[PDB]
Amino acid sequence: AHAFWSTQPVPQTEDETEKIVFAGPMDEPKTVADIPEEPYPIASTFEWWTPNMEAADDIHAIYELLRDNYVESMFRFNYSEEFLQWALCPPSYIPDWHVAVRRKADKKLLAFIAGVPVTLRMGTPKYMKVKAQEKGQEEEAAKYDAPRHICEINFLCVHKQLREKRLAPILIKEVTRRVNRTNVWQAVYTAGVLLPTPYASGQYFHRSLNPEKLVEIRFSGIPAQYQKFQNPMAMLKRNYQLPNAPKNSGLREMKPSDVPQVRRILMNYLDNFDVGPVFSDAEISHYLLPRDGVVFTYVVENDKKVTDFFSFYRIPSTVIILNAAYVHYYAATSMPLHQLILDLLIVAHSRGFDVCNMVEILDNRSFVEQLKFGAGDGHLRYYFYNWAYPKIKPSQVALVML
Ligand SMILES: CCCCCCCCCCCCCC(=O)CSCCNC(=O)CCNC(=O)[C@H](O)C(C)(C)COP(=O)(O)OP(=O)(O)OC[C@H]1O[C@@H](n2cnc3c(N)ncnc32)[C@H](O)[C@@H]1OP(=O)(O)O
């Protein structure tokens, strides 16, 4: 059973999503006045709290909750206060979409969920519009084509002492109410677990950058078939060896003056996909300008024209440090994508990253074999709240989730 999700405006079965023709809302429309301003009830020992992200103590409290109680044996992800700043506070973020529960008696932070604004293209997917054209339903299929200003949810976390108490449903209801008070009625979110009901699912992939280190810290092993070689580690270092420097002329760190051209080339690329974000210059600046410890972004520029760029973000892990790079956004116009991403690998390796990770969204499959990525055990599932949407392949998703 799904005692909570069965009550919510999401598709209830996979079959439901294989039969959805057009994008659009699931609930009939409501007004802001229909939504109460009183927060959702919670037990007397607890209080709702809206953290101030301009206050070092508040961001510290969030950091400590997630440090000990977020997604899980030899490694522990570390989401720094700077990383959390970055992820939670994009341009025009809404402070009360950062929703916390604290214990009244001692003010201990015990649960959290965050929404941030995103503008998303989420109209009827290409293959569904062809079926609609065939039936004279082009209009119904195109109704929701305009990019929509919605909520992206992340960092749901209930302290271990409060697990299995149905507090996550109360956090979800409360953030839903706060989003609906701003006249927003859809959200996008992801999870590594299967809930009702994803519109897309992609496997994770990894590429070792420093296999000697990975093996020493027991993050990677030496696979069975290398064990047959005379020198298994030299063969492993060989498989994954990278140049010391890239060979593409004009590759450099992205600067503020590159923002407008990066925005243009990224938006031209992301328009190719069924679901994807639309970013203003301020959002390009926020999400892509280099930020020590967090985001790394490079452009290929010559003659004052930016023709390509790539970005990756960092999530380090405590070894019970593993320095992981995650492919972020990119756009190639002057070179094959695999060469742009080779340059990403070379730069990440040079900066001391140990592994590069991605999910098979965007065109990430296109360079897997040649760049020595391997499939991993996880899948990232994409979901909408209050949005009927056909199943799509992960290569039609262009939204990277931090
Ligand atoms: C219009 C605006 C709309 C805005 C809102 C949109 C929707 C946003 C939705 C949220 C998106 C967040 C995405 C995101 O953050 C990225 S996925 C990362 C989620 N966080 C973690 O895994 C952290 C570690 N785990 C915990 O903190 C707890 O185990 C959590 C909090 C996960 C569950 O706490 P608990 O104490 O273990 O469990 P109960 O309180 O007793 O609740 C059990 C109910 O929770 C459902 N559950 C479990 N995991 C979930 C997950 N990852 N998403 C959604 N639902 C999840 C579960 O199916 C069950 O419902 P059911 O009985 O019907 O099956």
Author numbering: 11 to 82, 86 to 333, 340 to 421
Give excerpts from the publication:
LdNMT was co-crystallised with NHM, a non-hydrolysable analogue of myristoyl-CoA with a methylene group intervening between the sulfur and the carbonyl carbon in what would otherwise be the thioester linkage in myristoyl-CoA. The refined coordinates have good agreement with the X-ray data extending to 1.42 Å resolution, with Rcryst and Rfree values of 14.6% and 19.1%, respectively. There is a single LdNMT molecule in the asymmetric unit and the chain is well defined in the electron density maps, with the exception of residues 1–10 at the amino terminus and residues 83–85 and 334–339, which are not defined by the maps and assumed to be disordered. All 64 heavy atoms of the NHM are clearly defined in the electron density maps with this ligand residing in one side of a prominent groove running across the molecule. The fatty acyl-CoA binds to the N-terminal lobe in a site that is formed by the eCf elements that encircle the cofactor, with the A′ 310 helix and the Ab loop forming lateral interactions. In its bound conformation, 1070 Å2 or 88% of the cofactor's solvent-accessible surface area of 1215 Å2 is buried by interaction with the protein. The carbonyl group of the pentadecyl moiety is directed into the protein interior to form hydrogen bonds with the main-chain amide groups of Phe168 and Leu169, these groups forming the oxyanion hole. It runs into a deep hydrophobic pocket lined by residues Trp15, Ile166, Leu169, Ile185, Val192, Trp198, Gln199, Ala200, Tyr202, Leu208, and Tyr404. The most striking distinguishing feature of LdNMT is the additional pair of α-helices C′ and C″. These structural elements correspond to a prominent ∼ 20-residue insertion at residue 140 in the sequence of the Leishmania NMTs.
